[PDB]
């Protein structure tokens, strides 16, 4: 709830920290961080689904740090609270956060050197057994049902709002995605799935290594590893994506991006939707906010 009240958890539970300060660090929709002594990372969740997607992150993150060469969270102490469900102590990550917004101002010659680094990343991802990241508790995402049901979702909840111009655009996308084998066919990998620039923690004394971290791994699923660069079109913009995409050696820069792209789209749709369920009057004239400019973005596409 309050700060006295995650404060008191980690001093019943971990009465050895001295505590000299503390401070909100950052917020999503799954959890809530604050900062103590400016060293630490104490992560509570926000709800049931934030208490899942950190279960499976708890079991996957000690997997991960010896495969991926940035640092990423590491759980050095895990509480428990009055329900059962956990929260997490960390090391904090190092560095500036980088948010959308800021990837535009971004030093050009950092910026290649950050593509290159997320290429590996991914690359890195992509290389975990999945197998393995399955045992530890990461779900299997069917990706053709999920876009499916989101389809007939939007058909019916989101269609009442949208003007006929608006309706015709996201059934020729969802249209597709589905009518060309291509798009739909693909090897399922290990992804991270939030893979967005206020995750990525930068720092600007690395020539060589720019990109210091990666941080929330609660939607890591097994998925089509194109999926991981939604968020790099979306916030980094296209010319960024084809350099990633380039260093991972994909051959198709122009069909990956156009997949990429209906992604993008139906990620917007999937948003609104969910402000519709939730009955939030503004998560609602946003995501309206979104689709519009999605559809202006890919004019004539
Ligand atoms: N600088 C920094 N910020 C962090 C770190 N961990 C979490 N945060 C902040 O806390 C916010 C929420 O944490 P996150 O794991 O993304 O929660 P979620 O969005 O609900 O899944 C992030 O967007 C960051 O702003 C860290 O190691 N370093
Ligand atoms: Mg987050
Ligand atoms: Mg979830
Ligand atoms: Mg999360």
């Not at 609270?81 to 560095?95: A, E, H, M, T, W």
């Not at 593509?115 to 530890?136: D, H, K, Y």
């Not at 058909?155 to 111009?165: A, Y």
């Not at 693909?186 to 967005?196: A, E, F, Q, V, W």
Request: hydrophobic share 40%.
């Amino acid at each position: 709830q309050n700060k006295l009240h995650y404060t008191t958890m980690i001093m019943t539970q971990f009465p050895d920290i001295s505590i000299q300060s503390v401070e909100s660090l950052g917020e999503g929709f799954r959890n809530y961080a604050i900062l103590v002594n400016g060293d630490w990372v104490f992560r509570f969740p926000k709800s049931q689904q934030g208490a899942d997607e950190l279960n499976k992150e708890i079991q996957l993150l000690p997997l991960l740090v010896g495969c991926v060469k940035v640092n990423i969270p590491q759980y050095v102490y895990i509480g428990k609270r009055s329900d059962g469900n956990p929260f997490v102590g960390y090391r904090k990550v190092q560095g500036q956060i980088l948010g959308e917004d800021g990837m535009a101002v971004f030093p050009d010659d950092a910026k290649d050197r950050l593509a290159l680094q997320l290429a590996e990343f991914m690359n890195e991802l992509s290389a975990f057994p999945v197998e393995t990241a399955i045992s530890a508790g990461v779900p299997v995402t069917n990706l053709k049902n999920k876009i499916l049901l989101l389809s007939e979702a939007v058909e019916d909840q989101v269609f009442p709002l949208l003007d006929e111009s608006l309706r015709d655009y996201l059934t020729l996308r969802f249209q597709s995605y589905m009518t060309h084998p291509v798009y739909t066919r693909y090897t399922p990998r290990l992804i991270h799935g939030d893979l967005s620039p206020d995750h990525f923690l930068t720092n600007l004394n690395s020539r060589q290594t720019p990109l210091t971290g990666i941080i929330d791994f609660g939607d890591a699923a097994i998925s089509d590893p194109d999926y991981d660069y939604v968020y790099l079109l979306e916030d980094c913009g296209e010319l960024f994506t084809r350099q990633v995409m380039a260093y991972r050696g994909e051959v198709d820069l122009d069909t990956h991006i156009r997949k990429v792209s209906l992604f993008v789209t139906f990620d917007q749709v999937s948003y609104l939707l969910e402000g519709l369920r939730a009955r939030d009057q503004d998560w609602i004239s946003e995501g309206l906010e979104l689709l519009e400019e999605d559809k202006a973005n890919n004019f004539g596409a």
